[PDB]
Design a protein around this ligand. Structure first.
Ligand code: FES
Ligand code: FES
Lengths: 119, 119
Protein backbone atom coordinates (compact mmCIF):
# COMPACT_ATOMS: atom_id res chain seq x y z
CA UNK A 1 0.00 0.00 0.00
CA UNK A 2 1.27 3.44 -1.03
CA UNK A 3 0.53 6.44 1.19
CA UNK A 4 1.35 10.03 0.21
CA UNK A 5 1.67 12.35 3.20
CA UNK A 6 1.24 16.08 2.63
CA UNK A 7 1.26 19.12 4.89
CA UNK A 8 2.27 22.81 4.82
CA UNK A 9 5.05 21.92 7.29
CA UNK A 10 6.63 19.59 4.68
CA UNK A 11 8.13 21.28 1.59
CA UNK A 12 8.09 17.88 -0.12
CA UNK A 13 5.33 15.32 0.04
CA UNK A 14 6.53 11.98 1.37
CA UNK A 15 5.73 8.81 -0.55
CA UNK A 16 5.69 5.85 1.84
CA UNK A 17 5.35 2.14 1.07
CA UNK A 18 3.52 0.58 4.00
CA UNK A 19 3.14 -3.18 4.26
CA UNK A 20 -0.57 -3.99 4.37
CA UNK A 21 -1.72 -6.29 7.10
CA UNK A 22 0.60 -6.22 10.10
CA UNK A 23 -1.12 -4.26 12.81
CA UNK A 24 -0.64 -0.60 12.05
CA UNK A 25 -2.40 2.73 12.46
CA UNK A 26 -2.11 5.55 9.96
CA UNK A 27 -0.41 7.55 12.72
CA UNK A 28 1.92 4.62 13.41
CA UNK A 29 2.93 4.44 9.75
CA UNK A 30 3.52 8.20 9.74
CA UNK A 31 5.79 8.17 12.78
CA UNK A 32 7.82 5.21 11.48
CA UNK A 33 8.55 7.30 8.40
CA UNK A 34 9.20 10.60 10.17
CA UNK A 35 5.96 12.34 9.22
CA UNK A 36 5.04 14.46 12.22
CA UNK A 37 1.30 14.10 12.66
CA UNK A 38 0.47 15.74 16.02
CA UNK A 39 0.01 13.00 18.61
CA UNK A 40 -1.13 14.22 22.07
CA UNK A 41 -3.38 11.49 23.48
CA UNK A 42 -3.52 7.77 24.09
CA UNK A 43 -7.34 7.58 24.46
CA UNK A 44 -8.22 8.88 20.98
CA UNK A 45 -10.37 11.84 22.07
CA UNK A 46 -7.91 14.74 21.63
CA UNK A 47 -8.45 15.13 17.86
CA UNK A 48 -4.90 16.32 17.17
CA UNK A 49 -4.13 13.52 14.68
CA UNK A 50 -6.96 14.67 12.39
CA UNK A 51 -6.10 14.04 8.73
CA UNK A 52 -7.88 14.60 5.43
CA UNK A 53 -7.79 11.34 3.46
CA UNK A 54 -8.34 10.96 -0.28
CA UNK A 55 -8.74 7.38 -1.47
CA UNK A 56 -6.66 7.02 -4.62
CA UNK A 57 -7.60 3.36 -5.12
CA UNK A 58 -10.88 1.49 -5.08
CA UNK A 59 -14.35 2.96 -5.32
CA UNK A 60 -14.71 6.67 -6.07
CA UNK A 61 -17.43 7.14 -3.43
CA UNK A 62 -17.00 4.20 -1.06
CA UNK A 63 -19.87 1.75 -0.73
CA UNK A 64 -21.91 3.42 -3.47
CA UNK A 65 -21.31 1.74 -6.85
CA UNK A 66 -24.36 2.79 -8.90
CA UNK A 67 -24.00 3.92 -12.49
CA UNK A 68 -25.41 7.31 -13.42
CA UNK A 69 -28.07 5.47 -15.42
CA UNK A 70 -29.16 3.13 -12.62
CA UNK A 71 -29.46 6.05 -10.19
CA UNK A 72 -31.73 8.06 -12.52
CA UNK A 73 -33.96 5.02 -13.07
CA UNK A 74 -34.42 4.68 -9.32
CA UNK A 75 -35.32 8.36 -9.19
CA UNK A 76 -38.13 8.01 -11.72
CA UNK A 77 -39.56 5.43 -9.28
CA UNK A 78 -38.60 7.44 -6.15
CA UNK A 79 -36.40 4.56 -4.98
CA UNK A 80 -33.07 6.48 -4.14
CA UNK A 81 -32.93 8.31 -0.76
CA UNK A 82 -32.26 12.05 -1.08
CA UNK A 83 -29.09 11.73 1.01
CA UNK A 84 -27.60 9.24 -1.46
CA UNK A 85 -28.62 11.43 -4.39
CA UNK A 86 -26.47 14.30 -3.10
CA UNK A 87 -23.43 12.16 -2.28
CA UNK A 88 -23.18 10.54 -5.70
CA UNK A 89 -23.49 13.89 -7.53
CA UNK A 90 -20.26 15.42 -6.15
CA UNK A 91 -17.98 16.55 -8.96
CA UNK A 92 -14.73 16.41 -6.98
CA UNK A 93 -13.37 13.18 -5.52
CA UNK A 94 -14.63 13.65 -1.95
CA UNK A 95 -12.18 13.71 0.95
CA UNK A 96 -12.77 11.92 4.22
CA UNK A 97 -11.68 13.33 7.57
CA UNK A 98 -10.26 10.75 9.98
CA UNK A 99 -8.20 10.58 13.12
CA UNK A 100 -4.93 8.95 12.12
CA UNK A 101 -4.57 7.14 15.45
CA UNK A 102 -7.97 5.48 14.81
CA UNK A 103 -7.27 4.61 11.15
CA UNK A 104 -5.93 1.15 10.29
CA UNK A 105 -3.91 1.01 7.08
CA UNK A 106 -5.11 -1.54 4.51
CA UNK A 107 -3.99 -2.45 0.99
CA UNK A 108 -5.58 0.71 -0.48
CA UNK A 109 -3.50 3.67 -1.69
CA UNK A 110 -4.15 6.98 0.08
CA UNK A 111 -3.33 10.66 -0.01
CA UNK A 112 -3.17 11.90 3.58
CA UNK A 113 -3.22 15.65 4.22
CA UNK A 114 -2.86 17.36 7.58
CA UNK A 115 -2.36 20.97 8.54
CA UNK A 116 0.50 20.22 10.92
CA UNK A 117 -1.05 22.23 13.74
CA UNK A 118 -1.82 20.48 17.04
CA UNK A 119 -5.52 21.26 16.65
CA UNK B 1 -21.63 -15.78 -2.42
CA UNK B 2 -24.77 -16.65 -0.50
CA UNK B 3 -27.89 -14.74 -1.53
CA UNK B 4 -31.27 -15.10 0.17
CA UNK B 5 -34.18 -14.26 -2.14
CA UNK B 6 -37.43 -13.16 -0.50
CA UNK B 7 -40.76 -11.96 -1.85
CA UNK B 8 -44.51 -12.07 -1.12
CA UNK B 9 -44.96 -14.39 -4.12
CA UNK B 10 -42.95 -17.18 -2.43
CA UNK B 11 -44.07 -18.55 0.96
CA UNK B 12 -40.50 -19.78 1.40
CA UNK B 13 -37.36 -17.72 1.03
CA UNK B 14 -34.80 -19.25 -1.29
CA UNK B 15 -31.18 -19.66 -0.21
CA UNK B 16 -28.77 -19.55 -3.16
CA UNK B 17 -25.02 -19.90 -3.30
CA UNK B 18 -23.85 -18.10 -6.45
CA UNK B 19 -20.19 -18.10 -7.47
CA UNK B 20 -18.73 -14.58 -7.39
CA UNK B 21 -16.83 -12.66 -10.08
CA UNK B 22 -17.40 -9.32 -11.76
CA UNK B 23 -19.23 -10.50 -14.91
CA UNK B 24 -22.38 -11.89 -13.21
CA UNK B 25 -25.58 -9.96 -12.39
CA UNK B 26 -28.01 -10.39 -9.51
CA UNK B 27 -30.91 -10.88 -11.91
CA UNK B 28 -28.99 -13.57 -13.80
CA UNK B 29 -28.54 -15.72 -10.70
CA UNK B 30 -32.21 -15.09 -9.83
CA UNK B 31 -33.78 -16.43 -13.02
CA UNK B 32 -31.09 -19.06 -13.24
CA UNK B 33 -32.26 -20.48 -9.90
CA UNK B 34 -35.92 -19.60 -10.63
CA UNK B 35 -37.02 -16.69 -8.39
CA UNK B 36 -39.01 -14.79 -11.06
CA UNK B 37 -37.69 -11.31 -10.45
CA UNK B 38 -39.60 -9.19 -12.97
CA UNK B 39 -37.38 -8.77 -16.03
CA UNK B 40 -38.92 -6.52 -18.68
CA UNK B 41 -36.00 -4.83 -20.44
CA UNK B 42 -32.55 -5.27 -22.00
CA UNK B 43 -31.30 -1.67 -21.49
CA UNK B 44 -31.98 -1.34 -17.73
CA UNK B 45 -34.14 1.82 -17.72
CA UNK B 46 -37.56 0.21 -17.09
CA UNK B 47 -37.02 -0.35 -13.36
CA UNK B 48 -38.98 -3.60 -13.09
CA UNK B 49 -36.08 -5.59 -11.57
CA UNK B 50 -35.86 -3.25 -8.56
CA UNK B 51 -34.71 -5.10 -5.45
CA UNK B 52 -34.23 -4.20 -1.80
CA UNK B 53 -30.78 -5.42 -0.74
CA UNK B 54 -29.60 -5.91 2.84
CA UNK B 55 -25.88 -6.63 3.19
CA UNK B 56 -25.40 -9.55 5.57
CA UNK B 57 -21.58 -9.49 5.38
CA UNK B 58 -18.86 -6.86 5.49
CA UNK B 59 -19.11 -3.34 6.83
CA UNK B 60 -22.38 -2.39 8.50
CA UNK B 61 -22.60 1.00 6.76
CA UNK B 62 -20.66 0.57 3.54
CA UNK B 63 -17.62 2.82 3.27
CA UNK B 64 -17.96 4.26 6.80
CA UNK B 65 -15.55 2.54 9.20
CA UNK B 66 -15.51 5.11 12.00
CA UNK B 67 -15.99 3.89 15.53
CA UNK B 68 -18.70 5.72 17.44
CA UNK B 69 -15.88 7.39 19.39
CA UNK B 70 -14.15 8.69 16.26
CA UNK B 71 -17.42 10.19 15.02
CA UNK B 72 -17.87 12.07 18.29
CA UNK B 73 -14.40 13.61 18.00
CA UNK B 74 -14.91 14.71 14.39
CA UNK B 75 -18.41 16.05 14.98
CA UNK B 76 -17.11 18.04 17.95
CA UNK B 77 -14.56 19.73 15.65
CA UNK B 78 -17.13 20.17 12.88
CA UNK B 79 -15.23 17.74 10.63
CA UNK B 80 -18.02 15.17 10.32
CA UNK B 81 -20.74 16.22 7.85
CA UNK B 82 -24.26 15.85 9.16
CA UNK B 83 -25.21 13.61 6.23
CA UNK B 84 -22.46 11.12 7.02
CA UNK B 85 -23.58 11.04 10.70
CA UNK B 86 -27.13 10.20 9.61
CA UNK B 87 -25.81 7.14 7.79
CA UNK B 88 -23.69 5.80 10.63
CA UNK B 89 -26.30 6.45 13.34
CA UNK B 90 -28.96 4.19 11.81
CA UNK B 91 -30.45 1.74 14.25
CA UNK B 92 -31.54 -0.84 11.68
CA UNK B 93 -29.19 -2.42 9.15
CA UNK B 94 -30.00 -0.12 6.21
CA UNK B 95 -31.40 -1.53 2.97
CA UNK B 96 -30.18 -0.49 -0.47
CA UNK B 97 -32.45 -0.31 -3.51
CA UNK B 98 -30.86 -1.59 -6.72
CA UNK B 99 -31.81 -2.82 -10.16
CA UNK B 100 -31.11 -6.54 -10.26
CA UNK B 101 -29.91 -6.38 -13.91
CA UNK B 102 -27.38 -3.62 -12.86
CA UNK B 103 -26.20 -5.32 -9.66
CA UNK B 104 -22.98 -7.32 -10.05
CA UNK B 105 -22.48 -10.26 -7.68
CA UNK B 106 -19.46 -10.27 -5.36
CA UNK B 107 -18.51 -12.76 -2.65
CA UNK B 108 -20.34 -10.85 0.11
CA UNK B 109 -23.61 -12.31 1.37
CA UNK B 110 -26.92 -10.58 0.63
CA UNK B 111 -30.61 -10.68 1.46
CA UNK B 112 -32.52 -9.50 -1.61
CA UNK B 113 -36.20 -8.61 -1.37
CA UNK B 114 -38.46 -7.76 -4.30
CA UNK B 115 -42.16 -7.00 -4.44
CA UNK B 116 -43.00 -9.61 -7.08
CA UNK B 117 -45.12 -7.26 -9.18
CA UNK B 118 -43.58 -6.36 -12.56
CA UNK B 119 -42.60 -2.79 -11.62
S1 FES C 1 -3.91 11.38 18.91
FE1 FES C 1 -5.51 12.05 20.27
S2 FES C 1 -7.11 11.50 18.88
FE2 FES C 1 -5.53 10.61 17.65
S1 FES D 1 -35.03 -5.22 -16.31
FE1 FES D 1 -35.48 -3.13 -16.82
S2 FES D 1 -34.18 -2.41 -15.20
FE2 FES D 1 -33.55 -4.48 -14.87
Amino acid sequence: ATIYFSSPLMPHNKKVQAVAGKRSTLLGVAQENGVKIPFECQDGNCGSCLVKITHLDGERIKGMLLTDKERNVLKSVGKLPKSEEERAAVRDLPPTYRLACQTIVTDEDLLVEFTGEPG
